[PDB]
């Protein structure tokens, strides 16, 4: 029983230095976090300016590090020497990265409802994550019957989403999957003519 | 504008496994290979645009190891509680017969960062052209991981991503077949 061997207990220590950016680099917040197992125990927050204990386990470390004035000076300036530095290192291929979605429309292999056509809009390969995928019937946005997978991260600097619509396809009806995404100034559209 | 860059590290005992990586809005910029002692860029072009001195990561890892030992003793040897993963299998894009595609095994919401992943083709382990990411950080301090299998879609092959983890009593087995 157990899906893998070597069940000795484990002990885990994580350190995270988070640089949070608002309006470009107009505002910056550095958050250093120390986590033992699954419990954060002490942090430095640049909006605070000193180490603080999150749990009891972290109290000696806050006390020790707050006694080190060089260290506090260094951390207090890291919003500049670290966050804004690293922001500028990578801005052109991270912040500025724009990869256009590929959009395809097709009938589901599953057609559960007689006289209905279940349609699928596949939106893939795009960057960054912010996107809107919507269905239109003729000139009207469909506000009912739509189902979305929401945003899916692929782990490789691309995303995808899948949006389905049950249609009662009449003659002369045109169904359009329409995508708004920061990589394009005009929406992407792919149409299905019933 | 809203963006977050995270330098995330860890050390795990008794495995003696370290990790150091940078994350931008949830995607990995790079990590350091602790065996080769070298920077590994998540996309190849990143290494043409930027640099990172791997010895800084290795020095941090030594300190992380020392701090883990202290914290292990300080907590009276309180071990991590296993949190088993959630596993989803999807493809990179809509699947068409005989059009190369990629199967993604997404492993989420687990700790500690040790997990075993096997791709099975028609029930048999397959190694051809597989790749994987390091452990990726989550705000709840659990982890995420991706495994990839390029494949040529057919009606005759089925696939499973098999995931094992100390928090699972039995292997998770997540299936994919061509939607015929």
């Amino acid at each position: 029983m157990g899906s893998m061997g070597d069940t000795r207990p484990r002990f885990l220590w994580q350190l995270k230095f988070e640089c949070h950016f608002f309006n470009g680099t107009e505002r910056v917040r550095l958050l250093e976090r120390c986590i033992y197992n699954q419990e954060e125990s002490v942090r430095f927050d640049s909006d605070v300016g000193e180490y603080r204990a999150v749990t009891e386990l972290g109290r000696p470390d806050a006390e020790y590090w707050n006694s080190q004035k060089d260290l506090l000076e260094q951390r207090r300036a890291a919003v500049d020497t670290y966050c804004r530095h690293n922001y500028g290192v990578g801005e052109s291929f991270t912040v500025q990265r724009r990869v256009e979605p590929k959009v395809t429309v097709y009938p589901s292999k599953t057609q559960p409802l007689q006289h209905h056509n279940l349609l699928v809009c596949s939106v893939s390969g795009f960057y960054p994550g912010s996107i809107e995928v919507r269905w239109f019937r003729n000139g009207q946005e469909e506000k009912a019957g739509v189902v979305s997978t929401g945003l899916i991260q692929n782990g490789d600097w691309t995303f995808q989403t899948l949006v389905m619509l049950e249609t009662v396809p009449r003659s002369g009806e045109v169904y359009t999957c329409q995508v708004e995404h920061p990589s394009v100034t005009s929406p992407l559209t792919v149409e299905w003519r019933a | 504008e809203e963006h977050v860059i995270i330098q995330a590290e860890f050390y795990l005992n008794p495995d003696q496994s370290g990790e150091f990586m940078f994350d931008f809005d949830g995607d990995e910029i790079f990590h350091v290979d602790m065996a080769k002692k070298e920077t590994v860029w998540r996309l190849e072009e990143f290494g043409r645009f930027a640099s990172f001195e791997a010895q800084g990561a290795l020095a941090n890892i030594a300190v992380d190891k020392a701090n883990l030992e202290i914290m292990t003793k300080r907590s009276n040897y309180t071990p991590i509680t296993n949190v088993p993963p959630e596993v989803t299998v999807l493809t990179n894009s809509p699947v068409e017969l005989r059009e190369p595609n990629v199967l993604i095994c997404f492993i989420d919401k687990f700790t500690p960062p040790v997990v075993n992943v096997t791709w099975l083709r028609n029930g048999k382990p397959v190694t051809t052209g597989v790749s994987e990411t390091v452990f990726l950080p989550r705000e709840d301090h659990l982890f995420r991981k991706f495994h990839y299998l390029p494949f040529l879609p057919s009606t005759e092959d089925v696939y499973d991503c098999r995931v094992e983890h100390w928090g699972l009593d039995e292997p998770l087995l997540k299936h994919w077949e061509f939607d015929a």
Binding site: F17, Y64, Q68, H85 | A50, N60, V63, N67
Partner: peptide, 14 residues
Amino acid sequence: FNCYFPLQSYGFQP
């Protein structure tokens, strides 16, 4: 060079 800089981890009190 165009260099990512790490923040250095510091030890607990010995």
